[PDB]
Amino acid sequence: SRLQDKVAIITGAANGIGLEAARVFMKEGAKVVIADFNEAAGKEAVEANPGVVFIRVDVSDRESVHRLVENVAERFGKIDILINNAGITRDSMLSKMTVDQFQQVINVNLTGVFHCTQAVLPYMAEQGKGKIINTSSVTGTYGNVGQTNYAAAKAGVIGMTKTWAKELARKGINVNAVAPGFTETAMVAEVPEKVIEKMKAQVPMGRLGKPEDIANAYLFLASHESDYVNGHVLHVDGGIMM
Amino acid sequence: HMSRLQDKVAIITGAANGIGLEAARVFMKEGAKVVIADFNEAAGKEAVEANPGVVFIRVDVSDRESVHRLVENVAERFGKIDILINNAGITRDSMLSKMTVDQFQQVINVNLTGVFHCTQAVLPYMAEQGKGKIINTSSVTGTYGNVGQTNYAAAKAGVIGMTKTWAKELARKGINVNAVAPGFTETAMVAEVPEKVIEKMKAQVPMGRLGKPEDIANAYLFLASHESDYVNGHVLHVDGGIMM
Amino acid sequence: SRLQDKVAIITGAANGIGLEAARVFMKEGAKVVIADFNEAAGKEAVEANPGVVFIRVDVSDRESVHRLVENVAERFGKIDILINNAGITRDSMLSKMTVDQFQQVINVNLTGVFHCTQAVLPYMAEQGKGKIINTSSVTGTYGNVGQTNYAAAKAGVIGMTKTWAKELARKGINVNAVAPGFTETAMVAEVPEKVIEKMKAQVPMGRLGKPEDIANAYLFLASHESDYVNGHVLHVDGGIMM
Amino acid sequence: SRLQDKVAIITGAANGIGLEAARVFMKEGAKVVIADFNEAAGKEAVEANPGVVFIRVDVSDRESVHRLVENVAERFGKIDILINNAGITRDSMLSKMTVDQFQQVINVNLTGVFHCTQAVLPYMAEQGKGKIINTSSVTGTYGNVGQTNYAAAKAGVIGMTKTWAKELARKGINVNAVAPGFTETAMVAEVPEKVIEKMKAQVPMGRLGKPEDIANAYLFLASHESDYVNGHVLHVDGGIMM
Ligand SMILES: CC(=O)CC(=O)SCCNC(=O)CCNC(=O)[C@H](O)C(C)(C)COP(=O)(O)OP(=O)(O)OC[C@H]1O[C@@H](n2cnc3c(N)ncnc32)[C@H](O)[C@@H]1OP(=O)(O)O
Ligand SMILES: NC(=O)C1=CN([C@@H]2O[C@H](COP(=O)(O)OP(=O)(O)OC[C@H]3O[C@@H](n4cnc5c(N)ncnc54)[C@H](O)[C@@H]3O)[C@@H](O)[C@H]2O)C=CC1
Ligand SMILES: NC(=O)C1=CN([C@@H]2O[C@H](COP(=O)(O)OP(=O)(O)OC[C@H]3O[C@@H](n4cnc5c(N)ncnc54)[C@H](O)[C@@H]3O)[C@@H](O)[C@H]2O)C=CC1
Ligand SMILES: NC(=O)C1=CN([C@@H]2O[C@H](COP(=O)(O)OP(=O)(O)OC[C@H]3O[C@@H](n4cnc5c(N)ncnc54)[C@H](O)[C@@H]3O)[C@@H](O)[C@H]2O)C=CC1
Ligand SMILES: NC(=O)C1=CN([C@@H]2O[C@H](COP(=O)(O)OP(=O)(O)OC[C@H]3O[C@@H](n4cnc5c(N)ncnc54)[C@H](O)[C@@H]3O)[C@@H](O)[C@H]2O)C=CC1
């Protein structure tokens, strides 16, 4: 199998894209650690998918991340794949956005990616092998009304991805990003039915993404089938016009 | 290997050598019915001998009549065309100051117009099926430019413009259209440079190596399979993170 | 004057964007040669703008281009600026596009840029200075339904631009491109008004480009104020969503 | 006098690129406010460039920023142009980068841009006109070894730029970014001569940028000559290969 015996930490994997990625990765032979702040959802994933491991983490909290990685290393002795998939939104027009809304999103969606990647790095470096996959967004690449903070963070993730691809290549580590288009998860759940049709109208394929579509891109970037893909932003967005 | 392309009919242009040949092999292992479509008869025949189950049909992608002969033959034999990979390509390198009109036009004819001919030829089959995958081979030279390659850069960048247009036009027909931009990859196309300049292009790749045909073939497989169904209008770089 | 005594060849300058660029460049002190196939429009430009020079050219015809450049060189002794602005559209859905429609647009919009640039190059190389400005399009960068051929050509122009920036830098020559968004010229005059509103709807600024807007970008890229801009695609598109 | 009587706030303008932009803008008729924390350099700029105004600001301090903007509005009655040019580096390989280094750079180079833009916005919205120019970097667009934090911030600036172009367009405000290549300022000063040659080797033009080159791009994006340029990242990098 494509990920046989590989240990994968997937942040934000108690729900949505990350949860589906956990399942896909398990089907491909990986040992999967769901690292998520949502305990109830995490425990539900454990019950639903025999063999998956759940460890509670707040990716914005460096101590929490340190504990996560130590825990995984103690259990499995290695960390082969990190998917930085955890994210939040705190949408507001620029004219109304509070510092708290801005900083919260930076903390989770940008700094959290920094924390998790720094924490796994010494394990991958020792192994001389690793895959890091960072979740950006079409909002990061193209901008989006009401998302100053989320765009800042998701674009920032790309800058880090490109830097790390350059820094870590000599260590046998691949670093890439995925830019999902609008995808049917809880993150889209609270948007009005009206804007949903507008979002679909911007996609020539005429549909939103599914968690499985994005999980499939994570799988490509985590497997040997992408070994010469490095520093790339893989869009999975239906060809959205944005 | 899996069976991700089970019973899918794939035409891969330029598949008698290099990246295309490896893609033919990978696609066969994944269950596809593969047609190698290449101008090089001898290489095509050798590929068939070395890879039982593969079909070779000679084509010149720059010649529209040749392209229609190819596609009608594939349709007659297999009844459908699920995947087209526009992988055939040539180089006729020259500094701008010395480049002849023939060098420019030959590369446009094969690397740009040929992609147009093949895509137009397969389109009615895919439209009737309500499904299809088109994968166009661009290059880091198309995205970034490269000294001595005015013509090849024009063609490979042009391929991206067509890819993005087709992704918009054809999505409603159930067709995905994407491009791959390989970095420098170990094939005959690269073998014609001094190993001293090989280190130079290698030095621009943080991974410290050139691509292998299998690397590019693996990206073709991703873009041809259901695992990339929501990838559309995208240029997938397989270039080791090259600085260009 | 930003272009004082600079000799500028502007292809396609008998109408539209190129005509306004000719006027803008004249105001900034340049000696301007309008090179266009439309003889009547060219002669009209000469009458309306005392001092402009018109030389008929078909940019797709190499011999025509060589006569143009010989004529300019014999007359002014130098060529400082080339703007490859001539272009045509022959739109069709892929399913219906003829080889002739495809090839004509390639001939003018892609090969013509090759011809003109190759012809001016020896002059710029001998002087150790020059500015080449190539006109691409948002259709080249983003694709556009009905424009397989135009997108091929305009994207191809970007590939050549980047190649030439690398090749010619050592000769003291800057090479850049402009990607106009939808702009009010004869090229848009044939689209239905309903489509005009659709085009505008994609532009957050809520208006189309003016010939002067694009001419202003040509001026920037032709002047010393862009001496360290090289190999760049300058979008003048109102932030169009495409 | 392309900027005649326009009020421009240029953050970080006590030194380097910003200082040269202050000088260029004054020459073009602008009323320039240098906003910088470096008091000795700011005062020197005033003495050396009569007509310029210096107001002390720390862009990472929201209160300091609001005092700045209130001061400018009270004195000049309007704010026409904001250049978010202030920036710092705190370089380190990922393996050794501290949270302090990461956060300091985010605070100044990303959050500071948010603070300054939010603060000027109500004035530009009232005027129905304004120009916002954000300074990114080739490190943000391409990544650079040792610059995880700076790449995150400078890429994030592009995300915000694109979002703001979309949000603010119909208010008569242009929002664009500049991505300078390596440029001769104090930011590059303590780079070894051997590494300087390495950077030059990646630039086909064979030289680093000058502060005047970047200032000229700021001038383009601040003037009416770029009124239809929106949401664009203007590279001024000599065609660097990165
Ligand atoms: C990229 C893909 O998608 C697949 C491909 O095409 S495979 C490889 C791509 N092709 C290439 O890179 C070009 C290969 N051919 C060449 O390089 C040859 O130089 C040429 C045929 C273009 C010209 O030959 P030539 O007229 O004899 O000029 P030549 O003496 O070789 O080189 C002149 C200068 O340009 C430089 N140069 C040439 N090709 C270059 C390149 N690709 N990149 C950077 N510099 C280059 C050389 O270093 C040389 O520098 P100097 O003057 O300081 O010595
Ligand atoms: N759904 C969409 O349209 C798009 C989503 N993305 C990104 O895809 C990623 C996954 O999101 P979705 O599956 O769509 O939403 P989701 O809500 O289903 O999943 C997000 C998960 O992240 C977890 N999480 C949030 N903050 C956390 C923290 N501080 N520490 C640990 N875990 C935390 C949540 O608990 C949740 O389980 C995110 O990074 C999101 O920004 C990107 C583009 C589009
Ligand atoms: N090797 C490299 O570094 C890179 C190659 N590419 C592209 O990848 C593709 C495959 O090239 P390679 O495998 O590297 O080279 P290759 O030379 O090994 O294979 C090219 C094949 O195309 C065939 N071909 C050429 N002209 C043809 C025509 N008119 N009609 C039908 N077939 C024709 C050749 O006969 C040959 O078998 C090309 O499009 C090339 O431009 C892109 C980036 C890098
Ligand atoms: N108007 C628009 O929305 C956009 C236009 N562009 C490009 O801007 C450029 C200027 O176009 P416009 O001013 O809008 O159109 P235009 O139709 O007003 O001007 C085009 C000029 O090119 C000339 N021309 C055409 N073929 C020629 C040939 N073979 N040789 C010499 N001259 C020739 C025409 O006679 C005409 O005067 C073109 O390259 C066009 O593709 C790019 C993006 C948007
Ligand atoms: N020099 C280069 O190679 C490049 C520089 N940049 C950017 O260009 C901009 C200008 O930098 P340079 O002129 O090169 O460097 P510089 O060091 O000469 O000038 C930076 C100025 O910003 C000020 N500053 C720093 N933090 C501040 C704060 N919290 N509040 C107020 N002022 C503050 C400094 O006091 C200084 O005067 C920066 O944003 C930098 O990141 C981007 C790409 C290349």
What SS3 string covers chain A? CCCCCCEEEEECCCCHHHHHHHHHHHHCCCEEEEEECCHHHHHHHHHHCCCCEEEECCCCCHHHHHHHHHHHHHHHCCCCEEEECCCCCCCECHHHCCHHHHHHHHHHHHHHHHHHHHHHHHHHHHHCCEEEEEECCHHHHHCCCCEHHHHHHHHHHHHHHHHHHHHHHHHCEEEEEEEECCECCHHHHCCCHHHHHHHHHCCCCCCCECHHHHHHHHHHHHCHHHCCCCCCEEEECCCCCC
φ/ψ (deg, to 5) at C96: -120, -5
Residue at B104: amino acid letter: F
Number of neighbours of residue D92 by Cβ within 10 angstroms: 15
Chains that touch B (3 or more CB pairs under 8 A): A, C, D
Q: Indicate the top mutation candidate among C37, C54, C62, C203 to test ligand 4's pocket, ranked by most ligand atoms within 8 A of CB.
A: C37
| Amino acid letter, C164 | W
Who's near C76: CB < 8 A, 6+ residues apart? C7, C31
Q: How far is D214 from chain C (nearest CA, A)?
A: 8
In this complex, do D204 and C235 lie within 8 Å of one another by their Cβ atoms? no
Q: Whose CA is nearest to atom 39 of ligand 4?
A: C87
Phi and psi at C202, nearest 5°, equal -80, -10
Distances (CA, A) of C45 to C35, C40, C75, C188, C199: 11, 9, 19, 21, 30
Taking alpha carbons only, the member of D157, D213, D205 closest to residue D185 is D213
CATH topology (fold) of B1-244: Rossmann fold (3.40.50)
Question: Are the C-beta atoms of B160 and B142 separated by less than 8 Å?
Answer: yes
The residue behind tokens 């992608």 is B61
Q: Which of C1, C63, C2, C78 is nearest to C33 (CA)?
A: C78
> If you measure from the C-alpha of residue B187 to the centroid of ligand 3, how many angstroms do you get, rounded to a whole number?
9
Residue in chain B lying closest to A208 (CA): B230
For ligand 5, what atom is nearest to the CA of residue D64?
30
**How many angstroms separate the Cα of B58 from the Cα of each of A8, B21, B37?**
46, 14, 5
Other chains touching D, judged by 3 or more CB pairs under 8 Å: A, B, C
- Give the closest-approach CA distance of B51 to chain C in angstroms: 34
DSSP annotation string for B108-172: HIIIIIHHHHHHHHHHHHHHHHT-EEEEEE--HHHHH--TTBHHHHHHHHHHHHHHHHHHHHHGG
Asked if residue D9 has its Cβ within 6 Å of ligand 5, the reply is no
Residues 6+ apart with CB under 8 A from B16: B36, B38, B40, B43, B44, B46, B47, B56
> Determination technique for this PDB entry?
X-ray
Cβ(B95) to ligand 1 under 6 A? yes
Q: How many CA atoms lie within 13 A of A191 on its CB side?
A: 18
Beta carbon of B190 within 6 Å of any ligand 1 atom: yes
Q: Is B222 on the interface with D (CB under 8 A)?
A: no
User: Given A62, A97, A160, which is nearest D152 (Cβ)?
Assistant: A160
Calpha distance D197→B11 (Å, rounded) = 48
What letter represents residue B39's amino acid? F
Q: How wide is the angle at C-alpha A146 spanned by C-alphas D8 and A14, nearest 5°?
A: 135
Instruction: Output the six-digit token pair for C139.
Output: 């259709």
Backbone angles phi, psi at C110, to 5 degrees: -115, -65
CA quadruple D49, D50, D53, D57: dihedral sign: positive
Q: Answer whether A236's CB lies under 8 Å from A138's CB.
A: no
Chain C partners within 8 Å of D217 (Cβ)? 225-226, 229
Give the Cα separation of B26 and B218 in Å (integer). Answer: 8
Query: Are A208 and A199 within 8 A, CB to CB?
Result: yes
CA distance D178 to D84: 10
Closest ligand to C-alpha of residue B201 is 1
Regarding the beta carbon of C38 and ligand 4, being less than 6 Å apart is answered: yes
Mutate to test the interface with C, among A142, A241, A242 (most CBs of C within 10 A): A241
Q: Is A51 left (phi over 0), alpha (psi -120 to 50) or beta?
A: left
Distance from C-alpha of C105 to C-alpha of C3, rounded to nearest angstrom: 32
As beta bridge partners, residue D36 has D56
C-beta separation of C230 from D204 below 8 A: yes
Q: Which two tokens mark D91?
A: 């370089």
Residue given tokens 């000769």 in the structure block: C171
The b/e string for A52-86 (b: 16+ C-beta within 10 A; e otherwise) is: bbbbbbbbbbbebbeebbeebbeebebbbbbbbbb
Helix or strand or coil: residue C173?
strand
Judged by CB atoms closer than 8 Å, whether chains meet at C236 and D229 is answered as yes
**Would an 8 Å CB–CB cutoff place A204 in contact with chain B?**
yes
Contact between D184 and D209 (Cβ < 8 Å): yes
D98, D151 contact by CB (below 8 A) = no
Sheet holding D81-84, edge to edge: D53-56, D31-36, D7-11, D81-84, D130-135, D173-180, D233-236
The neighbour count for residue C68, using CB atoms within 10 Å, is 24
d(CA C154, CA D144): 31
CA C35, C40, C41, C44 torsion-angle sign: positive
For C232, phi then psi, to 5°, come to -105, 145
Distance, CA of C234 to CA of C179 (rounded, Å): 6
Say how far apart CA C168 and CA D204 lie, in whole Å.
9
Q: What angle do CA B231, B235, B236 make, to 5 degrees?
A: 80
Sequence-distant (≥ 6) Cβ neighbours of residue B175 within 8 angstroms: B126, B127, B131, B132, B133, B134, B166
Token output for D11: 């953050």
Our mutation pick for probing the ligand 4 site, out of C9, C17, C150, C235, counting the most ligand atoms within 8 A of Cβ, is C17
The verdict on B95 touching C (C-beta cutoff 8 Å) is yes
Residue B75 burial (C-beta neighbours within 10 Å; 0-12, 13-18, 19+): middle
By the 8 A CB rule, do D71 and D121 touch?
no
DSSP structure class, residue D136: -
Tell me which amino acid residue C119 is.
Answer: A
**Which secondary structure element, helix H or strand E, spans residue D83, and what is its range?**
strand D81-84
Q: Are C10 and C68 in contact (CB under 8 A)?
A: no
Query: How far apart, in whole angstroms, are the C-alpha atoms of residue C72 and residue C34?
Result: 11
Query: What single DSSP character describes residue C14?
Result: T
**Alpha-carbon distance C82 to A34, whole Å?**
58
Please check whether residue B241 is in contact with residue B188, taking contact to mean a CB–CB distance below 8 angstroms. Answer: no
The number of the ligand 1 atom at minimal distance from the alpha carbon of B148 is: 22
D76 contacts D4 by C-beta, under 8 angstroms: no
Chain A contact for B22 (CB, 8 A cutoff):
no
Largest Cα span, chain C: 51
Helix (H) or strand (E) holding C84: strand C81-84
C160 three-class SS: helix
Backbone angles phi, psi at B117, to 5 degrees: -60, -50
Q: Is residue B68 within 8 Å of residue B59, measured between CB atoms?
A: no
State the DSSP H helix or E strand holding residue B173, giving kind and residue range, or none if neither. Answer: none
Altogether, the residues listed in chain B come to a count of 244
Resolution (A): 1.3
DSSP assignment of D105-119 equals HHIIIIIHHHHHHHH
Edge-to-edge strands, sheet with C130-135? C53-56, C31-36, C7-11, C81-84, C130-135, C173-180, C233-236
Number of A–C residue contacts, CB under 8 Å: 7
φ, ψ of residue A144 in degrees (nearest 5): -160, 130
Within 10 angstroms of residue B182's Cβ, the number of other Cβ atoms is 29
DSSP-derived secondary structure letter, C111: I
Nearest to A35 by CA among A3, A67, A80, A2: A67
For ligand 4, say whether the CB of C64 is within 6 Å of any of its atoms.
no
B193 CB near ligand 1 (under 6 Å): yes
Residue A161: closest CA among B177, D225, D156, D2: D156
C-alpha gyration radius of chain A: 17
B239, B243, B244: best to mutate for the D interface, most D CBs within 10 A = B243
- How many residues does the structure list for chain C? 242
Query: Residues 128 to 187 of C: which have CB under 8 A from any D CB?
Result: 162, 165-166, 169-170, 181
Which residues fall within 8 angstroms of residue A194, CB to CB, at 6 or more apart?
Answer: none
E strand or H helix that includes residue C11: strand C7-11
Does ligand 1 come within 6 angstroms of the Cβ of B232?
no
Under 8 Å between Cβ of D157 and D110: yes
Residues in chain C with CB shorter than 8 Å from the CB of B162 are: 143, 148, 151-152, 155
Q: Report residue C76 as tokens.
A: 């002014």
Measured between CA atoms, how close is D239 to chain B, in angstroms? 10
Residue D236 with chain C: CB contacts under 8 Å: 226, 228-229
Given a contact cutoff of 8 angstroms between Cβ atoms, the answer to whether A144 and A85 are in contact is no
- Pocket flag, ligand 5, residue D238 (CB < 6 Å): no
Token couple for C81: 């600026």
Interface chains of chain A (3 or more CB pairs under 8 Å) = B, C, D
In angstroms, rounded to a whole number, what is the distance separating the alpha carbons of residues A94 and A147? Answer: 8
User: Across the interface, do A155 and D155 touch by the CB < 8 Å criterion?
Assistant: yes
Fold observed for domain D1-242? Rossmann fold (3.40.50)
Dihedral, CA of residue D101, residue D104, residue D108 and residue D109, to nearest 10? 30
Give the single-character DSSP code of C205.
T
Spatial neighbors of D47 by CB under 8 A, at least 6 apart, are none
What residue of D is the nearest CA neighbor of B201? D241
Q: Tell me the DSSP string of C18-62.
A: HHHHHHHHHHTT-EEEEEES-HHHHHHHHHHSTT-EEEE--TT-H
Q: Which residues line ligand 2 (CB under 6 A)?
A: A 11-12, 14-18, 36-38, 41, 57-60, 85-88, 108, 112, 135, 137, 180, 182-183, 185-188
Q: Contact, D181 vs A182, CB < 8 A?
A: no
Which residue, chain included where needed, has tokens 């310029």? D52
Instruction: Check: CB of residue B199 under 8 Å from CB of residue C194.
Output: no
Please, are residues A111 and D102 in contact by the beta-carbon 8 Å criterion?
Answer: yes
Query: Nearest residue on chain D to C181, judged by CA atoms?
Result: D228
Cα of A172 to nearest chain B Cα, Å: 8
Is B204 close to D242, i.e. CB distance below 8 A? Answer: no
Chain length of chain D: 242
**C92 close to B (CB below 8 A):** no
Pocket mutation for ligand 3, best pick of B11, B22, B35, B39 (most atoms within 8 Å of C-beta): B39
Atom number of ligand 5 nearest to Cα D180:
43
Give exposure, A176-202, as e/b (b: 16+ Cβ within 10 Å): bbbbbbbbbbebbeeeeeeeeeebeeb
